[PDB]
Amino acid sequence: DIQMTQSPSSLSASVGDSVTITCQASQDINQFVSWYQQKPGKPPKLLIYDASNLESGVPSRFSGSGSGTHFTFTISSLQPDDIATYYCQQYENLFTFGPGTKVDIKRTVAAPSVFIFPPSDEQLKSGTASVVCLLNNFYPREAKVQWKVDNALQSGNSQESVTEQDSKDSTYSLSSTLTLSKADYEKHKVYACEVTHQGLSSPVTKSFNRG
Amino acid sequence: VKLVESGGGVVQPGRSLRLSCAGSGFAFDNYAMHWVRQAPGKGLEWVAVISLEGRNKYYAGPAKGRFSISRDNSRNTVHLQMNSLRPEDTAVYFCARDMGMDVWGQGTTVIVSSASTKGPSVFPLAPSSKSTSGGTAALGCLVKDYFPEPVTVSWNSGALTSGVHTFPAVLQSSGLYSLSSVVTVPSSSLGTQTYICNVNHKPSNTKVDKKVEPK
């Protein structure tokens, strides 16, 4: 069936800059596309149809051009409410949304402030242990958390999530929790969270000894 | 104009659920209707379309013959019956009208899981030297092992908003959810100001106020 690419996967530009985003098809779809903008927790909003026709009430700074295989949605002067994920969509035959592309505001790099929390003694009574690592007020969004227990790489037993770009400082924050049994927790000594980020010349490590 | 979805809820894997979509503000028979779904943190996925008078039906791959999209041009409603749902179908389910999809609904959330309704255990994330950085301390509340979403969290009954980060929840391997909410405060304020996270899990009728004191 018809599948569509969206390039890039994420984009960053400053307020007033020109944002150009591409969408590709697995077919010659001529000019039969729509583009949508969707903000967190909100339904999509239709912006452009037939590749170039703006919808009613959509600012003139939103423009598109199309050519069967290669399509360009362009925000000609990025405004602060243009922070969203943008989705192209084909309808030359059936309908398929692209993967989408997130657009955030570009600010200077900010390294994360790293904080680490041992599991509470209340939780340890429950029979489980969660170790929490917080990465605060960093930019850009891309960061890597790597859990180590007595230097061992933890892989697959942690989960993380990220805030949306803060409305006034434009940074992200991330929280990762390492889940492990109380019995495994009491069996190891050094618990460490090692952060990789563009603002760090070398990975920063936050660690504690059980006790 | 307005589309209002209904249905939604926790249903067991393999069991049934029907979604409804009421449309106010226009003649319903002029437009084709869509159902579009969105998994947590994933992009829009087109489910199906119904032709303006119901003659032409088309579905997406992942439907795999399990869904059925019908239409009631007299009641201005479209439906989508889901007979044998898989956890892979967990998502917000949107309504949209088409000739582009200009009008959408706010969406209704289908939760497909065998987990039983459960209120969270609120554990402190106590501030310590290893949660401190140059006079800024971090503290929080781990809202662990609850089902289903949502859980709301404020601090000191809403009197504390600056420096709060309440992170998106995550679905643990156990099928229960877990989220954290963290605040950054001055270090020197630790021994003076009291920090309480007010947690509310209405599906389980559980409200918890958890004071977070240092170690």
Author numbering:
A (entry chain L): 1 to 211
B (entry chain H): 2 to 52, 52A, 53 to 82, 82A, 82B, 82C, 83 to 96, 100K, ...
Per the authors:
The HCMV Pentamer, composed of gH, gL, UL128, UL130, and UL131A, enhances entry into epithelial, endothelial, and myeloid cells by interacting with the cell surface receptor neuropilin 2 (NRP2). The other critical tropism-determining complex is the HCMV Pentamer, which is composed of glycoproteins UL128, UL130, and UL131A and the same gH and gL proteins that comprise the bulk of the HCMV Trimer. This elongated heteropentamer mediates tropism for endothelial and epithelial cells by binding to neuropilin 2 (NRP2) and triggering the viral fusion protein, gB, to facilitate entry into host cells. HCMV-directed antibodies isolated from asymptomatic donors predominantly target the Pentamer, suggesting that Pentamer-specific antibodies may restrict viral dissemination, making Pentamer a target for the development of vaccines and immunotherapeutics.
Model building was facilitated by high-resolution crystal structures of unbound Fabs (1-103: 1.9 Å, 1-32: 2.1 Å, 2-18: 2.8 Å, and 2-25: 2.5 Å), which were then used as reference restraints and lightly refined as a part of the complex. Three of these antibodies (1-103, 2-18, and 2-25) bound solely to the UL proteins at the head of the Pentamer, whereas the fourth (1-32) bound to gL near the junction between the UL proteins and the conserved gH/gL scaffold. Despite the ability to recognize the gH/gL heterodimer that serves as the scaffold for assembly of both the HCMV Pentamer and Trimer, 1-32 was only capable of neutralizing HCMV infection in epithelial cells. In contrast, Fab 1-32, which binds to the junction between gL and the UL head of Pentamer, occupies the same space as several of the loops of the a1 domain of NRP2 (residues 45 to 48; 72 to 77; 106 to 110) via its CDRL1. Given that higher concentrations of antibody are typically required to inhibit adhered virions compared to free virions, it is expected that 1-103 and 1-32 exhibited substantially weaker neutralization potencies in this post-attachment assay. Because the dimerization interface is formed by two copies of UL128, it is likely that the binding of 2-18 and 2-25 would prevent dimerization from taking place while still allowing NRP2 engagement to occur. It is likely that 1-32 would also interfere with Pentamer dimerization; however, this antibody also competes with NRP2 domain a1, as we show here.
